[PDB]
């Protein structure tokens, strides 16, 4: 349900079991790794109220790599708290939420940044080419 700086991650919500697959995989993998956490850290981040739950998982895809990674990010907890009451918490879903966003920036809504704009100049944007007429 959440897109990230030219990327976009979709949310799956309806109670089930373990193995929450991202794309069509398993937030065990998610191999653009290094910072492979911050993904498993939404679920881990559940460290504030829940321990893992027993629910669902969906696929992302847009822009490029770390973009996507950051997208699947919100994607998750931006879908634990899912309305609710069949998804979030049948009452006071600020349970997670305010907790899963008292140290967040992914589920903590998205960033007002997004690529565009250049210039009749050099590279463009602001970096206008280097000229030194004599």
């Amino acid at each position: 349900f959440g897109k990230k700086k030219s990327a976009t991650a979709v949310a799956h919500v309806k109670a089930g079991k373990g193995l929450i697959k991202v794309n069509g995989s398993p937030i065990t993998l998610v191999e653009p790794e290094i910072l492979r956490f911050k993904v498993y850290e939404p679920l881990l981040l559940v460290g504030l109220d829940k321990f893992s739950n027993i629910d669902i998982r969906v696929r992302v895809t847009g822009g490029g790599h770390v973009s996507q990674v950051y997208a699947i990010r919100q994607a998750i907890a931006k879908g634990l708290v899912a309305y609710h009451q069949k998804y979030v918490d049948e009452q006071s879903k600020n349970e997670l939420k305010k907790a899963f966003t008292s140290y967040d920036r992914t589920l903590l809504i998205a960033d007002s940044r997004r690529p565009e704009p250049k210039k009749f100049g050099g590279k463009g944007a602001r970096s206008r080419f280097q000229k030194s007429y004599r």
Binding site: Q85, E90, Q91, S92
Partner: protein, 634 residues
């Protein structure tokens, strides 16, 4: 005499069992019921409260009759003559006997007494509004007949009063004094009598279920209908074209019989409680297919015949037993929610029309043992929670549709519900268990939100501050629990010296009071989690208590038959009232204007005016011995 409270009025009274009267109202009819020492007058076609007698009689009203625009009410050796609830005249019979029966016809007023005398008063001039001059005194000696059961006037019987006794039927000429007729002995005791809509015929009910059509002219039976194993308590003929007869019984049944087809039409089963006399009166309205019924169970019902079995049309009533729990339903002083041991939940209006309505339970639910209501979410979802005797779940109700709600809230620890509460926002319901658990439910979805386990004995009180920050509880273990609502942390515990039986939380001041078995009232600050005051004075078990809206006062009631006012800045009792009828509930109106009390005897709710909206001087035996408000007010 009290410095704070002065009696205003009583709410929720409709009928007490005295057979209601019917009179003429322009084109429509009016119904006169008895409330005790007061009568009330309703429209027969709407059941709108038209009048209430402005001044209480010295003793309980025993008999009611209506004649045109005048109401005749019997009590002691007297007959009061009223118009528009206002006494226009008082007849004091020259006797120490009590009036039992009345009959008004022609220029005459006939009032029989419990020594078988019949006092006859007469109009001086036929165009007088009512009889006022004593004319004569008839007597039915035991050889002439038995104990007088009823006085009736048959159509076209000029100057002739029909006096039906337990054993026979007499006919007196009240002008000449002559006993012109006396029937043969009746074998079985006559309990009821009713003029038939045809010449010379009177219907007589017996202790055995027999209705006898008797011809006064020829002095013989014409017809005898048997109602198996019933005791007849009322008779009335339908007069809209259908030759039907209604027979009320002491068991609370109303039987409809076709006189022409000689068959039982129908029977309304248990429309009035048998333990309160069953059907004490049932009357077809003249020219209408409508029958009005009543009993001693504080209800007045109306049944119709559509152009087929009779169909419930409308009714008015209150509790048949004293209210056990009450609450103001709103901040506009519109409704009060009230529960009684008669297993009913009612909403009573505080306004002039005295409207009321029982909460639909669509054999009743067990008696309510705890009640909570919040007006915030009215219409949106359930806003009432009730605990029921020996049940492990609380029920919910909807104030908008005056009906039971969708959810039941289980204790989860196999205990009974002993306390209930609600958030001010109306989002949450709180349930306290006899096993110690506290459960928090979502009023919108019915889902269990949170569960706490601190108490090891019954939780007798629960509440939450207006900002939903801190939750407080009390129990028979003498523990006061303080919890964080947003998390589930135990914020603290207090251990009091006695079992705690009840809690009242004051949301605008964040103080809450507790009633203890040691007869004290403990006041605690929820913010500091400390006891700030302790009130000593009552000599018996505390029944109820409440905060004055400002937070300055606490008013309390007890088995000691007192109602006391406590000033919190000093902790001293600044006013005390001694009642002859123990108060079981005391509640302040949301605005400081009124005080509602419920008592051990009486079906209604007493309203008091807080005329102190005062000194801080202590009291002792300077308490006022005040009587409850008059039923004649408003």
């Amino acid at each position: 005499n009290s410095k704070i409270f002065s009696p205003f009025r009583i709410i929720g009274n409709v009928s007490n069992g005295v057979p209601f009267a019917t009179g003429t109202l322009g084109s429509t009819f009016y119904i006169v019921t008895c409330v005790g020492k007061t009568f009330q007058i309703y429209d027969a076609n709407t059941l709108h409260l038209l009048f209430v007698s402005e001044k209480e009689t010295p003793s309980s009203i025993v008999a009611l009759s209506a004649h045109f625009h005048y109401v005749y009410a019997a009590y002691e050796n007297k007959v009061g003559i009223y118009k528009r609830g206002i006494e226009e005249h008082l007849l004091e019979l020259e006797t120490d006997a009590n009036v039992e029966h009345l009959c008004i016809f022609g220029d005459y007023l006939c009032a029989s007494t419990d020594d078988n005398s019949i006092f006859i008063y007469k109009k001086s001039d036929p165009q007088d509004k009512y009889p006022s001059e004593f004319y004569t005194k008839l007597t039915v000696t035991e050889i002439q007949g038995g104990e007088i059961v009823s006085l009736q006037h048959l159509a076209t019987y000029l100057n002739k009063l029909t006096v039906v006794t337990k054993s026979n039927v007499l006919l007196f000429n009240v002008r000449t004094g002559k006993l012109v007729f006396t029937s043969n002995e009746f074998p079985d005791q006559i309990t009821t009598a009713e003029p038939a809509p045809v010449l010379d015929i009177i219907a007589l009910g017996t202790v055995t279920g027999e209705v006898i059509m008797f011809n006064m002219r020829k002095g013989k039976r014409i017809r005898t209908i048997k109602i198996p194993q019933s005791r007849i308590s009322s008779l009335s003929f339908r007069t809209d074209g259908s030759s039907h007869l209604s027979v009320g019984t002491s068991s609370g049944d109303l039987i409809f019989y076709d006189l022409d087809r000689r068959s039982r039409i129908h029977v309304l089963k248990n429309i009035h409680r048998e333990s309160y006399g069953g059907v004490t009166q049932a009357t077809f309205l003249n020219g209408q297919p409508i029958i009005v019924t009543s009993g001693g169970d504080n209800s007045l019902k109306e049944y119709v015949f559509d152009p087929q079995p009779p169909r419930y049309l409308r009714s008015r009533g209150g509790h048949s037993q004293p209210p056990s729990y009450i609450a103001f339903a709103d901040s506009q002083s519109h409704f009060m929610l009230s529960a009684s041991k008669d297993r009913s939940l009612w909403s009573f209006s505080l306004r002039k029309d005295a409207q009321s309505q029982e909460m639909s339970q669509r054999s009743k639910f067990p008696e309510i043992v705890a009640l909570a209501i919040e007006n915030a979410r009215i219409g949106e979802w359930e806003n009432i929670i009730t605990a029921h005797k020996d049940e492990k779940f609380a029920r919910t109700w909807d104030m908008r549709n005056k009906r039971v709600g969708r959810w039941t809230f289980d204790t989860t620890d196999d205990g009974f519900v002993k306390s209930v509460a609600m958030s001010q926002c109306g989002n949450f319901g709180f349930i306290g268990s006899s096993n110690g658990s506290i459960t928090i439910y979502n009023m919108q979805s019915g889902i269990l939100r949170k569960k706490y386990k601190l108490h090891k004995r019954a939780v007798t009180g629960i509440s939450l501050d207006g900002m939903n920050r801190k939750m407080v509880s009390c129990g028979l273990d003498g523990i006061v629990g303080f919890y964080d609502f947003n998390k589930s942390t135990l914020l603290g515990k207090l251990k009091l010296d006695a079992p705690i039986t009840a809690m009242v939380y004051h949301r605008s001041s964040d103080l809450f009071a507790l009633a203890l078995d040691d007869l004290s009232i403990v006041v605690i600050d929820a913010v500091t989690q400390r006891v700030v005051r302790q009130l000593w004075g009552h000599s018996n078990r505390i029944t109820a208590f409440d905060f004055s809206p400002e937070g300055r006062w606490i008013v309390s009631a007890s088995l000691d038959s007192t109602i006391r006012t406590w000033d919190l800045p000093t902790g001293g009792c600044i006013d005390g009232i001694i009642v002859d009828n123990v108060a079981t509930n005391v509640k302040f109106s949301p605005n400081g204007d009124l005080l509602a009390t419920t008592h051990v005897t009486g079906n209604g709710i007493c309203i008091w005016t807080n005329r102190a909206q005062s000194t801080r001087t202590i009291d002792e035996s300077e308490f006022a011995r005040m009587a409850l408000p008059s039923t004649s007010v408003r």
